Amino acid sequence: KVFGRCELAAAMKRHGLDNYRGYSLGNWVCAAKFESNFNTQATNRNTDGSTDYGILQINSRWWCNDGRTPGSRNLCNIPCSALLSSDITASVNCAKKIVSDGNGMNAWVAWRNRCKGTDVQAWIRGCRL
Ligand SMILES: [Br-]
Ligand SMILES: [Br-]
Ligand SMILES: [Br-]
Ligand SMILES: [Br-]
Ligand SMILES: [Br-]
Ligand SMILES: [Br-]
Ligand SMILES: [Br-]
Ligand SMILES: [Br-]
Ligand SMILES: [Br-]
Ligand code: NA
Known part of the structure; x- marks a missing residue:
């Protein structure tokens, strides 16, 4: 499933991501934008043999099998495939664990390089939240 911008913000807020570990909704949406372009089925193979899965491109090295x-x-105790569902529950649950790991959202390199320190509010702007 390829979410729309505001559709994902709503789903992320519903699943309790709005300011989870201090990170505003706009951060999570921006992260999703540049990680997967809002596509739940996104996959990308890393040079280390691991693979990234889902809206938030969660990696198999640590987080899923x-x-x-x-x-x-498999620290999120899920099949990586669960992270590709149109239902983002598994991705959100797992992401909550990752961002609580110590380095915040820096765990997502696209967030650090493309979202960090930007006007993240723009990503939820106009949305009925
Ligand atoms: Br967009
Ligand atoms: Br929920
Ligand atoms: Br925001
Ligand atoms: Br494995
Ligand atoms: Br599993
Ligand atoms: Br499994
Ligand atoms: Br959902
Ligand atoms: Br959830
Ligand atoms: Br933090
Ligand atoms: Na794994």
């Missing part, structure tokens, strides 16, 4: 990332962990 895809059964093809030698020596990796």
Whole structure:
């Protein structure tokens, strides 16, 4: 599923992402924009053999099991495929764990490089929230 901008903001707020660990809704939406362009089915293979999955491109090295990332962990205790569902519950649950890991949303390199320190409010602007 390819979410619209405000549709995702609504879903993310519903699932309790609005200011989770101090991060405003606009941050999470911006992160999704540049990670997956709002597409739940996005995948991207890393050079280390790991793979990123879903709206927030959560990686198989630490967070999910895809059964093809030698020596990796599954800290979110889910199949990586669950992160590709049109229902973003698994992605949100897992993301809450990642951002609580110590380095905040810096865990998402696209967030740090493209969202961090920007007017993130713009991403939820005009939306009925
Ligand atoms: Br957009
Ligand atoms: Br919910
Ligand atoms: Br915001
Ligand atoms: Br594996
Ligand atoms: Br699993
Ligand atoms: Br599994
Ligand atoms: Br949803
Ligand atoms: Br959730
Ligand atoms: Br933080
Ligand atoms: Na894994």
